[PDB]
Amino acid sequence: RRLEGKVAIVTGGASGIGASTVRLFHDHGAKVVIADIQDDLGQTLADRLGRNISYTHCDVTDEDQVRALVDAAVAKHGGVDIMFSNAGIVEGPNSIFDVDKDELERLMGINLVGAFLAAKHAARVMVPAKKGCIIFTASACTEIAGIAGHSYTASKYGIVGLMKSLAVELGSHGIRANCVSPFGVKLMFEGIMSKVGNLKGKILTAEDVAVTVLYLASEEASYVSGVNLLVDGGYTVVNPTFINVITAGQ
Amino acid sequence: RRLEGKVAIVTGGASGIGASTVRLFHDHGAKVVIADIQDDLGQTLADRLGRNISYTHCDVTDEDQVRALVDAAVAKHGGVDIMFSNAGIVEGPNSIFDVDKDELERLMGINLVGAFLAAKHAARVMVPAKKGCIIFTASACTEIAGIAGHSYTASKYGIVGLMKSLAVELGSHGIRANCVSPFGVSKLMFEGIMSKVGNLKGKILTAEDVAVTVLYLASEEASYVSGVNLLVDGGYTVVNPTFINVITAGQ
Amino acid sequence: RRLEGKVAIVTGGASGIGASTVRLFHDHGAKVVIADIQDDLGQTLADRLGRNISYTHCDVTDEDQVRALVDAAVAKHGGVDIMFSNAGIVEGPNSIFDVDKDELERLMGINLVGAFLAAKHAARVMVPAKKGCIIFTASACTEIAGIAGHSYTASKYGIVGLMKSLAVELGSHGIRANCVSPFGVMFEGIMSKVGNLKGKILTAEDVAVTVLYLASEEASYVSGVNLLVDGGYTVVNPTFINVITAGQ
Amino acid sequence: RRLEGKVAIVTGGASGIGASTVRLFHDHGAKVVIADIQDDLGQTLADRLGRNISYTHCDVTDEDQVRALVDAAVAKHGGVDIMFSNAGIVEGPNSIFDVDKDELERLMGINLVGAFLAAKHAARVMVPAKKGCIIFTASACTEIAGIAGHSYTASKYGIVGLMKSLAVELGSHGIRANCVSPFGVMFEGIMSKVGNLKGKILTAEDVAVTVLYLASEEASYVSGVNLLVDGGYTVVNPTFINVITAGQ
């Protein structure tokens, strides 16, 4: 139990990466507040896990709801040690011709502006306590192109920049900020990832990402801050096209 | 004249970096369309420079005006070779406590969403021509913290990411995308600050210096340069001098 | 115990970061071979920790000793799961005028060429097993200037590049490669004034914990990563903010 | 003529990127000293270009020759404004199993240690003049894996690190340091298939133009930059899109 007594907020934690982090955060002894718009999954998950895991409906585009979410966790557990800003919507690779302004602004509002508000209100409770961790979910697209849509990539770069500015401002008060950038998080999707991944014999699951958030959130990373930690099996470090052409013709 | 016959759109080009790029773009023989909301500066500048430089009012938060701006340059000059997406608003270092959602969304709309629309409509005219370059103004803050506000930094990172996705998608059609990230662009009060702050000494960054770097990336001297966020910061972003200052102070 | 059954080689592990990783690697159940030229510390440490920790003299500039080190761990424990290439020598900030070619080549040989040989011989035993982890100790200087000597910085960049090429070549066989870049591992008051993150001093024990992460199956999909342990130091140039605040 | 009156040293400038930079440097009015071990190409090129281009035999692994090269250009033209450290040897993609220690040390000595000596002796003449530019040839491999050999990649990362430390130390005296990292400088059909940016083949002449930019006063505030000339190759891993597309 690597977070006994700690208090964690997980936005976007009723499915996906957020839901496995909630389960993991729970196995290691944290108190966790689930914040999501998926009210049915969110409440069912919070009820299955026990008393230290409660659900609160929060649209992270609405600052009133975000402020209420942080205020209520501080009313209930006395403070916020971990903010995991995981809410967002995804976009596979597309064209700049596909980009619609209304949809771009809708995505920016959930992915990027939701992270500002999560950060702004966690910092508001952590700074006077002089401790805390903020973790954002970015994406491997922040390091290599060709795996995500244009709008999604821009919003995820913005999160990295916000995370690094937070790391400076909040470092003065003992507070850490970091990002985790996964890559390729049913059956039709395994075989492609087996073809696409740089590291072989290993498929990335949501549970694996949750483990990396556990590291960054814990006191095993007590001096880690400002880091966008990639979980991509090396995918981002290689362009294999050149080697494929030398090998194909020879 | 390193761009003879080329056609350039400069959004946010009536003041600052945009205005010096317009002048430079003009000295080197480009046709340039100025796109700005500063209608008085924009039109005066376009009138002083001559026939190849015309002004068009464009709010880059409004896709209709952006679409009209690109359509009209293609109506008058036959195509668009260079899009310089330079429109944006600035914000010095601040606190996450200072961030107001309405102001964050207003800044995101001008800095980031304006760049998407500039890109989307330039690409629309360049792809069938199989040539062109898109240049964005990012900022040295995309490489080092502590020189810009939180909202501004996030929007400028988004531009880098957009620029790199564009470099992939549009490379297939011959089109280049790049960013230029300046640092350092009461006039004297701010100059003595930069003399104390800059890593490279004996040299003050001006808007004219940035315009020269955009000239490079826009020209055929960078005909194979794409996907690059080119810093113009005298090295500021590569050093944290705190450790050396403390060893020297106590010794 | 997050590595029960695993076999680890730690070069340069009789002092410093290497020695705390050895102790940590041991608490979590690994078999560890210590490889160092500090024969007195190395053997004392190996004797204090128990049967699963043994010392072997290895100069990592000598490929024959490196080859013997890997061959003997494979003779003794059946394979090598973790190679922690930690051997190296340090240089504080200096001048390009200070750089002597002989000293430069001596440093390149220990820091950089020692890492090639460590990698080359670990890969030789791991590839046919289709598993393993290689971790290098780089430095926060690979991300920001002004905290290390010129020769030292170049050798530590070379290690990052070697680590990323390895991550590609060896990923095809299931093998991971990563780096850990610490910062600031009399001296406390320096780091208390210098660090970006306040109220926390970096120790060797903290780095050992980060190597534990990268070495373990909690990073089973982490590869090609130069993981900084610097409290944010590398992400900020605070000069501009200091001048605005000083004059105002 | 963008460098009228300037004085440039080009190591490794009798062939390849170095030779086209020499020609370009010459067209734009610089005085250039060619430094190479290819004595036949070097002298023929220097004789073809005129009086402002002279050749000097210099092995950049030998500090005595490097020191003589810089001392003689300062004796002959009064100072050194541009040092283009371009000497080096190449390695295509290979295996960590292919790496031989003697070969690794030979490559480190030419690529990396040659750059230290070039830098150290240019700085020695530029610092008292309070102006100058040092440019290194790195490689696109410093940004993406899979296009160069292991030894070559490590040596080219070391150059980036050396360049960034130099940018800090020498900025205090007005001196700039930068790198240029080209990519893909039978073989053109390969590059037509491999390049991200289409309808354009990278030549040595294109790189020379980028060195011209960094060397000139059009980059008078550019320092610490590893400028890639790769048509975007380093920013994309197209594998995922290729596997989706073949199915869709």
Author numbering:
A (entry chain D): 8 to 192, 204 to 268
B (entry chain C): 8 to 192, 203 to 268
C (entry chain A), D (entry chain B): 8 to 192, 206 to 268
What do the authors report?
BDHs belong to the family of short-chain dehydrogenase–reductases. The members of this enzyme class have a TGXXX(AG)XG NAD+-binding motif and a YXXXK active-site motif and form dimers or tetramers. Some BDHs have a high twofold stereoselectivity in the conversion of chiral monoterpenoids by preferring one of the two substrate enantiomers and forming a stereocenter by asymmetric reduction of the diastereotopic keto group.
The SrBDH1 preparation yielded a single peak in a SEC-MALS analysis, consistent with a tetramer in solution, in agreement with its crystal structure. By picking 1 635 690 particle images from 1666 micrographs, we generated a data set of similar size to that for SoBDH2. Almost the entire protein chain could be traced in the cryoEM map, which is reflected by an exceptional atom inclusion level at the moderate contour level of 0.3 for 97% of all backbone atoms and 93% of all non-H atoms. In addition to the first eight residues and the very C-terminal residue, the region from Leu193 to Leu205 is not defined in the density due to the missing NAD+ cofactor, as in SoBDH2. The SrBDH1 model derived from the cryoEM map is virtually identical to the apo-state crystal structure (r.m.s.d. of 0.6 Å for 982 pairs of Cα atoms). At 1.88 Å resolution we could identify 399 water molecules, which uniformly cover the protein surface or are bound in cavities within the protein core. We observed 34 side chains with a double conformation, corresponding to about 3.5% of all residues. To our surprise, we could not observe NAD+ in the cryoEM structure of SrBDH1, although the protein samples used for crystallization and cryoEM were identical.
